[PDB]
Design a protein around this ligand. Structure first.
Ligand SMILES: *CC(=O)N1CCC2(CC1)CC(CNC(=O)C1(Nc3ccc(Cl)cc3)CCOCC1)C2
Ligand SMILES: *CC(=O)N1CCC2(CC1)CC(CNC(=O)C1(Nc3ccc(Cl)cc3)CCOCC1)C2
Ligand SMILES: [Mg+2]
Ligand SMILES: [Mg+2]
Ligand SMILES: [Mg+2]
Ligand SMILES: [Mg+2]
Ligand SMILES: [Mg+2]
Ligand SMILES: [Mg+2]
Lengths: 236, 5, 236, 5
């Protein structure tokens, strides 16, 4: 890889600079290079990796949704035939999105997950695996769609099982995982009741554990709890 | 769209 | 070029889709491909070209400013030595920015300007030439800095001369050219009085010609007049 | 920074 010649520490330094400059593609390339050094990532480093790729794929997803909407309107009754261009460009953006997802999943599989022994690292990586299979699922229309959905479900489920055993109900990683798995249920698995149940139970169990926290931990946990409440409000 | 982190 | 196999009309169609999806890099690549077909551009096509590259380089400039600021702070008294990384990454972004500028200038020189015979097309392209030399000037520190600044000035000046002879004082292209040349004077040429004089004279001459316009033309012209006033307010 | 178009 093109980052092979750069020091791990320099790659991390530059990822931070890229974040400040809102250069998320660069940020992702630097973090990829860092991961490929083969050493485990710290908490802060894991965050840099996730931030970088979340922003890159987030932009791709937004673009894909715009194009998909235009494409769907083109195939409505009375719509004038404008040729293959809308499909082609949606496919281009889709292929790019899929490439990014495959890249992240690749890093997780080679070899971040297998070396992650602590609850916080293993849950975070499995959450990421769930997320990037969920993004693949959003654009999937073929033979492997069900298997993609199951790959997301399986990753989220393992993360859930570990998080329930090893982390307090207010742990931001546990909360973020639950938030996202709940969205998976609602948007991907056609299981809105599972989504609502998970969001509510997660919220209520966290509420009950807030008394144990410092002011700073309270702020962290309640921020994500509000997102759970936001989704519940949207869905009920 | 719903919130994710 | 990679767009060599795609129809001119399809490239234009996709540039519009890219704009809707806020995919300005794609938009620029499509418009580059369109230009390289060798046919003159229409008014709408010229706008698509300018929008695409303005957004791409605009993002680069914002990033470069963030990095340059961090770099300047690193070389202040008492600042801890963090190594070559800040300079390296600023240089990376700079080199990319310069590449985009060279690409646009290349298109203008081969062969958009030489075939632009109408006032509106020739002024618009020369304005662009001024702009992309101005962006080069923003990052220039070497032997050729003065020549870069002069290349910008020369392009803006020719555009000014044509616009004064061939276009009404309210013409949005004439107004936009004047706006930008005024900023060139203030930010690049160390000539704030020239900048203020140009902004004021342009504003006042446009005001006097507003009576000749339709409602829609009035809206177009006054929008850019407000930008002139905004700059004057900033500078006085 | 000043306005340009
Ligand atoms: C120890 C470890 O692995 N960590 C990585 C994950 C954390 C804790 C440390 C850093 C991240 C901070 N982010 C947020 O608080 C927040 N986004 C996320 C993102 C992902 C997860 Cl799993 C939780 C929270 C910032 C944006 O608002 C929401 C919270 C947690
Ligand atoms: C005929 C021709 O060559 N045209 C190209 C330039 C125009 C007119 C047609 C299209 C563009 C529309 N843009 C704006 O009105 C505005 N930005 C610009 C950009 C560049 C110039 Cl030279 C003028 C105005 C949109 C954003 O707000 C400012 C006006 C003019
Ligand atoms: Mg080393
Ligand atoms: Mg496809
Ligand atoms: Mg349950
Ligand atoms: Mg053809
Ligand atoms: Mg340089
Ligand atoms: Mg004068």
């Amino acid at each position: 890889g093109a980052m092979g010649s750069m020091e791990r520490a320099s790659l991390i330094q530059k990822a931070k600079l890229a974040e400040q400059a809102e250069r998320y593609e660069d940020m992702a390339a630097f973090m990829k290079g860092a991961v490929e050094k083969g050493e485990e990532l710290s908490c802060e480093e894991r965050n840099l990796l996730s931030v970088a790729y979340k922003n890159v794929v987030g932009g791709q997803r937004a673009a894909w949704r715009v194009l998909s909407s235009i494409e769907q309107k083109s195939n409505e009754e009375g719509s004038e035939e404008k040729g293959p261009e809308v499909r082609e460009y949606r496919e281009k953006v889709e292929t790019e999105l899929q490439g990014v997802c495959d890249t992240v999943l690749g890093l997780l599989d080679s070899h971040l997950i297998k070396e992650a022994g602590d609850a916080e690292s293993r849950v975070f990586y499995l959450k990421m695996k769930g997320d990037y299979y969920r993004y693949l699922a959003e654009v999937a229309t073929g033979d492997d769609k069900k298997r993609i959905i199951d790959s997301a479900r399986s990753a989220y489920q393992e993360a859930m099982d570990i998080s329930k055993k090893e982390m307090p109900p207010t742990n931001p990683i546990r909360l973020g995982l639950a938030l996202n798995f709940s969205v998976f249920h609602y948007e991907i698995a056609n299981s809105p009741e599972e989504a609502i149940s998970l969001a509510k139970t997660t919220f209520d169990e966290a509420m009950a554990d807030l008394h144990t926290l410092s002011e700073d931990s309270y702020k962290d946990s309640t921020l994500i709890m509000q997102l759970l409440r936001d989704n519940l409000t949207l869905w009920t | 769209f719903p919130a994710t982190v």
